[PDB]
Amino acid sequence: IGRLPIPVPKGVSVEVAPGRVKVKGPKGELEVPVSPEMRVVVEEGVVRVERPSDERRHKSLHGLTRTLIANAVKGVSEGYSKELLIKGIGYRARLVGRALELTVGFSHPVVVEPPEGITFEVPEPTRVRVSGIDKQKVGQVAANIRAIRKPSAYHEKGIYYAGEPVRLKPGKAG
Amino acid sequence: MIQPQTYLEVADNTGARKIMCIRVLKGSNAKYATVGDVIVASVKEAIPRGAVKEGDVVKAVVVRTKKEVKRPDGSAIRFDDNAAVIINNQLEPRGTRVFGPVARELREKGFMKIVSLAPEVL
Amino acid sequence: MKGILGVKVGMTRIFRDDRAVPVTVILAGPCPVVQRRTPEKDGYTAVQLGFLPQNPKRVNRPLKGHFAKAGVEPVRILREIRDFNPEGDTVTVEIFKPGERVDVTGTSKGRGFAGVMKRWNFAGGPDSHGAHKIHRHPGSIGNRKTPGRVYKGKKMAGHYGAERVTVMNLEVVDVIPEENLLLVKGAVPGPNGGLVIVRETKKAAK
Amino acid sequence: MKVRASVKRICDKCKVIRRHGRVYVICENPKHKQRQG
RNA sequence: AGUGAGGGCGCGAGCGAUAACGUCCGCGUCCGAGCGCGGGAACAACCGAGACCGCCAGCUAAGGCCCCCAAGUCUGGGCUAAGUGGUAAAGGAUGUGGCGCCGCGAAGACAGCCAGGAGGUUGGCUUAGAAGCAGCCAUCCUUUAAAGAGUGCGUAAUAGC
RNA sequence: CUCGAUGUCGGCUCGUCGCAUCCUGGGGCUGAAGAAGGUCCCAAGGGUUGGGCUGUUCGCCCAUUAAAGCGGCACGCGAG
RNA sequence: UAACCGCUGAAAGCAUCUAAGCGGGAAGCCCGCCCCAAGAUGAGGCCUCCCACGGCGUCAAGCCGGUAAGGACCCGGGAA
């Protein structure tokens, strides 16, 4: 009824191999997990995740294999770029090539490195983020960077995802 | 050379060139009112007038007798034990005082005044 | 990074604009007496000797163990792993460059047999209000039903001199390439005019 | 915040989070860090 | 002729704090004084059981059968999965599984979605502001996406979600 | 159990484990600006001074200190 | 890895660090640091070297020389 419907457009390399499903698209040969009982098909344009039951384990498993391998696909279709925005009077940014310029620790050496699907985008640099491929590892690295200085609820000067409304509280007494 | 409890000598605005220190002002584990150091004490000896009194200051380490061994293998020993009394900051006590030169002191540095102050013979 | 030696004696010297004290290291130059090839002793390494005490005196075995890659006529020998032999004979006439940091050790001069007194710190007990043991003696050793007995590994009286050991970092100070000698300002680890060795390890980030 | 007990949520919409036998309430207000595992 | 003082367990009253391998009395068993065997790890009194002496005999208690060690790593149907097994209460909880029950307007559901979030809604005080999103209650009307006497981020009302 | 025998205090000397950790760090929280406090969960690693008076350990007081913890072992220690 | 922070994600067709799978992280845990150590009968591993030593009832795992192959003994010396 509902927790298993998805199409596999682009004629993507949509195949199941040694107990691992191989989703190959712009290159992201993404390895989407395959629980032995979940099971799925990709015929015509329709890709379906099945349920060898419906109890707790399985049902969640469904939500997963479905959503996550769904990922495998959408991903293999484009290229996974994380939109991110650096912003704060205290900070600098430029690709440098394969790292993380960055400067707001007032002893700025910030020489980072790009894991993989990770390409650096400095078009601002106020607006500035990265592109990845692997939705999981991408949101992640993004995070790594955010984390390393970003916080600031009461005074801003950080890195922000899309940049949530950053809830902020007063300083002294007024 | 050192001591905890001590009958030491001074010669600043002293009540008497003598006070008894408790211990060393250094790294919490005294045991050595040592050459060129800074420590704690009260008076032992008398004091004609003088705004000094029978109280207690802290201050800095002069002479010793049991090896003033310096960086340059400069070497010495005076058959005398005494330091200069301090007022807070360190800023020495008296206008002058009876004694003289030699590395260790100035070297500790913080007290140049003592430095130029006790120069000549004695 | 290793030197094999006959430790001489400790003495004082001067450096820059100040004196300070060193020690006399002396080593003719050990040589590839035995090699653990790895396929040989996958604990790969070099064993060498560095002098020579009388030949008329020498077990056959020794004679041929030498035979091996054949070298000379001594008796001072020992081994160390993870150290290539970019040679087949070593001296230190450069082997050990000065103005460098080193680590080193040797035999440990042989003490005696003194209790709580020696062996360990804290000089014995006290003396006066009690003299049925005057000044020092053995601390305490356990108790009633705690472990219900006598303990098993706290310091103890006696023999504590016939052993060996080493010192962490020390300075290479100076190199005398002729008389294969080097001054190093060292804890003269163990006697002198006897046996020692040096090795260098310290990826120490200050 | 934590407490080997209590926790009846709070921040008017304070979340009952299941994590490691860890009775942990999660919200949008630090005031509610409810760690009772 | 011997004990003329004894303890334990279960139930029933004391007492004690409804504490103690406490001490008081009673019904029973007990254990000594047989209570020497099984046993529960090993443990005087907790379930089994009375040993006159044999058996390189077989049926059984209790309680056991992957192994250490005799005995199915039986079959059958479940429910937990924390290692509970392998001591604990008060009490806490979108634990796990189970009821015996509630919402299904396929006049096609809920979390996810889209857009509008309607005009009198405009003081009552306070109006510096209520003109739902400042305090003392208001509980009506038209009007359609069906209607918020406006559950909520708020300041100067207000303006926006 | 112990009265055919179990040395009770205070201290000494050598201590050994423990965490409801004092200093240490790791932390979320603040009525958190900074700094600094204070509010809990994690973690014993090392560390966890001198004197004064008092036979008193506790204690009060002098001087510092990063700090100068509570306590288990017949309140460890007489075959020391 | 502790608390504590996150990524990807369902079962709770919006959400969640959370079984699934991934990461951050403590002066603490294994290592790295030195010091013991196959009497770790589960080593000995490598090097050199005397010979497979010589006589005795086969089962010769007993005798004697065998080798100074080597070492012990006594002597003489040692911060051992």
**Which residue from A70, A55, A79 is spatially nearest to A9, judged by alpha carbons?**
A70
Mention every residue, 6+ apart, whose C-beta is less than 8 A from residue B69: B75
Place of tokens 């005019």: C193
Q: Is C4 in contact with C21 (CB distance < 8 Å)?
A: no
Distance CA A130, CA C183 (A): 58
Q: Is C36 in contact with C47 (CB distance < 8 Å)?
A: yes
Give the phi and the psi of residue A11 in degrees, each rounded to 5.
65, 20
Residues A1-32: b if buried by 16+ CB within 10 A, e if exposed: eebbebebeeebebebeeeebbbebeebebeb
Q: Residue A99, CB half-sphere, CA atoms under 13 Å: how many?
A: 11
CB-based contact (8 Å) between B72 and chain C?
yes
Residue D22 CA, distance from chain mean position: 9
Q: How far is the CA of C206 from the C1' of G50 (A)?
A: 56
Distance CA B37, CA C107 (A): 39
Q: Is B11 in contact with B97 (CB distance < 8 Å)?
A: yes
Amino acid letter, B107 = R
The answer to whether A and B touch (≥3 CB pairs < 8 Å) is: no
Distance CA B73, CA B69 (A): 6
DSSP codes joined into one string, chain B:
---SSEEEE--SS-SSSEEEEEEESSSS------TT-EEEEEE-S--SS-S--S-EEEEEEEE-SS-EE-TTS-EE--S-EEEEEEBTTB--SSS--S----THHHHH-S-HHHHHHS-S--
Strands B81-86 and A119-121: unpaired
- Quickly list H helices, chain C: 60-67
- Quickly list H helices, C25-92: 60-67
Place of tokens 């035979």: C67
Specify which residues C183 forms β-bridges with: C24, C174
A60 CB-to-strand G distance under 7 Å: yes
Q: Which nucleotide is nearest to C201 (CA to C1')?
A: G33
Q: 3-state class of C92 per DSSP?
A: coil
Q: Is C84 in contact with C173 (CB distance < 8 Å)?
A: no
Q: How far is the CA of C99 from the C1' of F19 (A)?
A: 50
Max Cα–Cα distance, chain C, nearest Å: 71
**Burial of residue C189, with CB atoms counted within 10 A of its CB: 0-12 exposed, 13-18 middle, 19 or more buried:** buried
- Interface list for chain C against chain B, based on CB atoms closer than 8 Å: 17-20
Specify which residues A160 forms β-bridges with: A85
Contacts of C18 in chain B (CB under 8 A): 71-73
Q: Is B11 in contact with B49 (CB distance < 8 Å)?
A: no
**Burial of residue C94, with CB atoms counted within 10 A of its CB: 0-12 exposed, 13-18 middle, 19 or more buried:** exposed
Q: Is B54 in contact with B47 (CB distance < 8 Å)?
A: yes
Comparing alpha-carbon positions, the chain C residue that sits nearest to B71 is C18
Strands A46-49 and A40-43: antiparallel
CB-based contact (8 Å) between B75 and chain C?
no
B73 and C19 within 8 Å at the Cβ level: the answer is yes
Ramachandran quadrant class, C153 (left: phi over 0; alpha: psi -120 to 50; beta: rest)? alpha
Rounded to the nearest 5 percent, the helix, strand and coil shares of chain A are 20, 20, 55
* 3-class SS letters over D1-37: CECCCCCCCCCCCCEEEEECCEEEEECCCHHHCEECC
**Burial of residue C167, with CB atoms counted within 10 A of its CB: 0-12 exposed, 13-18 middle, 19 or more buried:** middle
Would you say how long chain D is, in residues?
37
Mention every residue, 6+ apart, whose C-beta is less than 8 A from residue C43: C36, C81
Cis peptide before A5 (omega within 30 of 0): no
Q: Residue B83, CB half-sphere, CA atoms under 13 Å: how many?
A: 34
Distance CA A149, CA A8 (A): 39
Task: Report, in angstroms and rounded to the nearest whole number, the Rg of chain D calculated over CA atoms.
Answer: 9
Give the phi and the psi of residue A135 in degrees, each rounded to 5.
-30, -40
Q: Is A35 in contact with A52 (CB distance < 8 Å)?
A: no
Q: 3-state class of A136 per DSSP?
A: helix
Q: Residue C117, CB half-sphere, CA atoms under 13 Å: how many?
A: 13
Distance CA C52, CA C55 (A): 8
**Which residue from A80, A79, A88 is spatially nearest to A142, judged by alpha carbons?**
A80
| Interface test mutation site (partner B, options C12, C18, C21, C185, max chain B beta carbons within 10 A) | C18
Structural element, H or E, at residue C3: strand C2-10
Q: 3-state class of C133 per DSSP?
A: coil
Mention every residue, 6+ apart, whose C-beta is less than 8 A from residue A84: A128, A129, A130, A142, A145, A146, A159, A160, A161, A162
Q: Two tokens at C104? A: 């080193």
Contacts of C17 in chain B (CB under 8 A): 72
B73 and C17 within 8 Å at the Cβ level: the answer is no
- Quickly list H helices, C52-178: 60-67
Q: Is B8 in contact with B83 (CB distance < 8 Å)?
A: yes
- Quickly list H helices, A1-154: 56-77, 135-147
Instruction: Compute how many other C-beta atoms are within 10 angstroms of the C-beta atom of residue A103.
Output: 16
∠ CA C101-C110-C115, nearest 5°, is: 115
Mention every residue, 6+ apart, whose C-beta is less than 8 A from residue C33: C47, C48, C49, C65, C66, C68, C71, C77
Mention every residue, 6+ apart, whose C-beta is less than 8 A from residue C195: C5, C6, C7, C76, C106, C107
A61 CB-to-strand G distance under 7 Å: yes
Distance CA C119, CA C140 (A): 15
Give the phi and the psi of residue A143 in degrees, each rounded to 5.
-45, -65
Q: Is A84 in contact with A125 (CB distance < 8 Å)?
A: no
Residue A11 DSSP class: G
Q: Residue C81, CB half-sphere, CA atoms under 13 Å: how many?
A: 6
Q: Residues B88, B91, B95, B99: is their CA dihedral positive or negative?
A: positive
Place of tokens 């015929």: A43
Distance CA C38, CA C82 (A): 10
Residue C70 CA, distance from chain mean position: 27
Distance CA A163, CA C17 (A): 61
Instruction: Compute how many other C-beta atoms are within 10 angstroms of the C-beta atom of residue B67.
Output: 11
CA A49 → CA A32, A46, A158, C131, C171, distances in Å? 13, 10, 41, 91, 70
Q: What is the resolution of the experimental data for this entry, in Å?
A: 5.0
Place of tokens 């020390």: C170
Q: Residue A36, CB half-sphere, CA atoms under 13 Å: how many?
A: 0
Distance CA C19, CA C10 (A): 14
Q: Which nucleotide is nearest to D15 (CA to C1')?
A: E94
